[PDB]
């Protein structure tokens, strides 16, 4: 009960504030209210260009791309091909440190295997680099106990995912999230011919754009447009209306709660909480000085199916692009906001409640 039209003034005055204080030159938003999705554009795309947001353009989604990841690899589960109580030796063999002994695939996942580290160092150029490099790892602690956010776990997560179907991390994705979703401009690269889409992130007043890294594509490289990503939403706050039954299975699998860490529980690649919330319990845990410490988990085991009634969300960040996507399954209300700068995550927590709570 509420209009299109005055939505769009709390989306105006909402965002076109937070541009200004935030340095965002653009801006792509989605609000889903309804079944369908509204969309709002401000901003510049390329300044020098003047190319202003549209509902085509493509950002970095950074972080959020691990949501494709824990769905890729619940769509596994479903298929019969993977587990996530598996070990992660099952998967690569060739990881025989007996340190890997009591890892399993869900802590690759959900960050507990135990102190893997933020990035894979840029000095791994190849798969036997990389193998090196988990061998040479000695964790801090025992599997299950702490909670470190890092690309060295779901990055792993995903190419071992993705194994036993013989196909490529980049091929899985669209062959089974992508095509049967429709994101038909969703890009691990983007080719020549979408080229122009793609805006470029601002660093500190810089142009810029994300630099490859192994295993880019499975923790941060994805990219899309409003459109695309409002579909991803839809398609993960309403999973009954996807055809695809490892899909959808598995989009539910990633909503599942394995970890509560404070009051956030640990999907694989979202991230949850019940509803209702406050604002405050948001954004208290979306700065970084929470998001990327290491926090003690409690375990949920069995873990929980997904809830409805729950605020689910990922934030996600390049060095010039900064995203945040949040919807609530219960009410049906969600939304993205693409950003070509990297403003603070408590920022996009603060405004995406104070939107969605016009719902």
């Known amino acids: 009960p509420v209009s299109e039209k005055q939505l769009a003034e709390v989306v105006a005055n909402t965002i076109t504030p937070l541009m200004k204080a935030q340095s965002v030159p653009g801006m792509a938003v989605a609000v889903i209210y309804q079944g369908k999705p509204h969309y709002y554009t401000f901003g510049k795309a390329d300044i020098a260009a003047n190319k202003p947001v549209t509902p085509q353009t493509l950002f970095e989604l950074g972080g959020i791309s691990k949501t494709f990841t824990g769905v890729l690899g619940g769509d596994a589960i479903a298929r019969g091909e993977i587990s996530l109580d598996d070990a992660v030796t099952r998967y690569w063999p060739q990881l025989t440190g007996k340190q890997w002994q009591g890892i399993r695939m869900l802590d690759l996942a959900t960050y507990t295997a135990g102190g893997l580290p933020l990035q894979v160092p840029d000095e791994v150029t190849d798969n036997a680099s990389l193998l090196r490099f988990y061998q040479n790892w000695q964790p801090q602690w025992k599997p299950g106990t702490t909670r470190l956010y890092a690309n060295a776990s779901i990055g792993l997560f995903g190419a071992l995912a993705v194994k036993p179907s013989g196909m490529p991390y980049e091929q899985a994705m669209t062959t089974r999230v992508l095509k049967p979703l429709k994101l038909d401009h969703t890009w691990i690269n983007v080719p020549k011919a979408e080229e122009a889409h793609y805006a470029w992130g ?20 994805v990219k899309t447009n409003v459109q695309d990503m409002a579909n991803w939403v839809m398609a993960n706050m309403a999973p009954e209306n996807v055809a695809d039954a490892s899909l959808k299975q598995g989009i539910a699998l990633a909503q599942s709660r394995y970890w509560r860490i404070g009051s956030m529980y640990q ?30 988990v409690a375990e949920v085991n069995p873990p929980a199916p997904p809830v409805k009634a729950s605020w689910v969300h990922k934030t996600g960040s390049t060095g010039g692009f900064g995203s945040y996507v949040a919807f609530i399954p219960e009410k049906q209300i969600g939304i993205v906001m693409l950003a070509n700068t990297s403003y603070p995550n408590p920022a996009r927590v603060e405004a995406a409640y104070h939107i969605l709570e016009a719902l």
């Open 267 to 296: 999907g694989l690649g979202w991230e949850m909480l019940n509803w209702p919330v406050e604002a405050n319990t948001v954004v208290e845990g979306s700065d970084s000085k929470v998001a990327l410490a290491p926090l003690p």
């Open 202 to 221: 601002y660093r500190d007043g810089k142009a810029v754009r994300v630099s490859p890294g192994m295993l880019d594509a499975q923790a941060y490289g």
